[PDB]
Amino acid sequence: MENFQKVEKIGEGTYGVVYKARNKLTGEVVALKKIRTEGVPSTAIREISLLKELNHPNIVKLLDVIHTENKLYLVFEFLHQDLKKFMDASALTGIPLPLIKSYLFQLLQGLAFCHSHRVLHRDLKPQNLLINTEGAIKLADFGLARAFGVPVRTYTHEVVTLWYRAPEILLGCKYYSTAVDIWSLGCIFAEMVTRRALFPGDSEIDQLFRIFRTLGTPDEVVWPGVTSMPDYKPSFPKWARQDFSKVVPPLDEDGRSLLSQMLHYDPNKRISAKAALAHPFFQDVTKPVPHLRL
């Protein structure tokens, strides 16, 4: 891009390719996302444009929205490392519990803020969570999903990750609620703790069944209305719920209790980000400095 200089290709998300770039004129280093195409809804640019007004310490700042030559560019403040990379780098020893707790607390503050502003993420995953050297963690790509839709993959033949998708989405619900983000974050919390994805599905049905094998096949008792969901099939196998202490060992009972509330089947029973911030698990929360190798 004439105004910048692709330092490097950062990565690839469900909505587009991300680049690290320096504003040739201002020298500011930013993350530039290119949205993939002759229509380009004008209702979306307005939607996205409103996101520039979102300012919170745990939300990656959206600096600009540029529509040109069919291409759409989102300019974000740049952070050096995503959580997926950090988890991989910390796989041998594991992320210390105090840091896991700090990150979870911060992410809930970010979700509490967005949700109070009626903004949902809808596609949270480790790759969408960014960290810096001072111990902060921030959510990136909030609200893009709503202003947009949902491509078959990403944009150019790439396996979209289903591991963090809430059951109501997998069952075909047409209306999403803030609960979908709490579910994704619970899946991420578990993954930081055990160092293994909680529900690593390789297909939509495998994703759903992995959830059922662990949390039990949902029924009308625990989830009123589940048997009427669009993709619910009476033929789903009926698996018994697993003892919860086997899911995220060796997490303590405060942590297991909070996780269980973030993973309730019924979106209406699932804990809100604000209520989660008050959970006893955070009574001793601190803000540790991570060991980041950049």
Ligand X SMILES: Nc1nc(N)nc(-c2cc(F)ccc2O)n1
Binding residues: 10-18, 33, 77-79, 82, 125-128, 141
Closest to ligand X by CB, 60 or 273: 60
CB nearer ligand X, residue 127 or residue 272: 127
- Using CB under 6 A as the binding rule, the residues of this chain from 75 to 94 that contact ligand X are 76, 78-82
- The residue (of 102 and 127) whose beta carbon lies closer to ligand X is 127
Residue for token digits 């921030």? Answer: 138
Tokens of 204: 């939509």
The separation between CA 277 and the C-alpha centre of its own chain, rounded to angstroms, equals 17
For residues 259, 257, 119, 134, the Cα torsion angle rounded to the nearest 10 degrees is -70
- Beta carbon of residue 12, minimum distance to ligand X (angstroms, whole number): 8
From CA 268, how far away is CA 266, in angstroms rounded?
5
Quick one: which segment of 21-29, 71-79, 165-173, 219-227 binds ligand X (CB under 6 A)?
71-79
Nearest residue to 211 via CA among 199, 222, 200, 227: 199
Which of 11, 94, 200, 216 binds ligand X (CB under 6 A)? It is 11
Single-letter amino acid, residue 123: D
Question: In the window 235-264, what residues touch ligand X (CB under 6 A)?
Answer: none
By CB under 6 A, what part of segment 109-128 binds ligand X? 127
- Of 4, 14, 21, 31, the one binding ligand X (CB under 6 A) is 31
Could you say which of 65, 75, 130, 197 contacts ligand X (CB under 6 A)?
130
Residue 250's contacts (CB-CB under 8 Å, 6 or more residues apart) are none
Q: Which residue's beta carbon is nearest to the bound ligand X?
A: 31
Q: How far is the CB of 92 from ligand X (least distance, A)?
A: 21
Distance from first CA to last CA of the chain, Å, rounded? 25
Q: Which of 51, 106, 115, 141 binds ligand X (CB under 6 A)?
A: 141
Q: Which residues carry a binding-site annotation for Mg(2+)?
A: 128, 141
**Interaction between residue 18 and ligand X (CB under 6 A):** yes
- CB-nearer residue toward ligand X: 144 or 248: 144
Which of helix, strand or coil describes residue 292? coil
Pinpoint the alpha helices (H) of the chain: 42-51, 83-89, 97-116, 144-147, 167-170, 179-194, 204-215, 253-262, 273-277
What is the Cα–Cα distance from 168 to 269, expressed in whole angstroms?
Answer: 13
User: What minimum distance in Å lies between the beta carbon of 106 and ligand X?
Assistant: 16
Cis link prior to 250 (omega < 30° from 0)? yes
Shortest reach from residue 281's CB to ligand X, in Å: 28
Please tell me the count of residues contacting ligand X according to CB under 6 A. 16
Three-state SS at 18: strand
Q: Give CA–CA dist 243/87, Å, rounded.
A: 26
Decide if residue 19 touches ligand X (CB under 6 A).
Answer: no
CB 112, min distance to ligand X, A: 20
Q: Which residues are catalytic?
A: 123
- Asked whether 67 and 34 are in contact (CB, 8 A), the reply is no
Binding site for ligand X (CB under 6 A): 10-11, 18, 31, 33, 60, 76, 78-82, 127, 130, 140-141
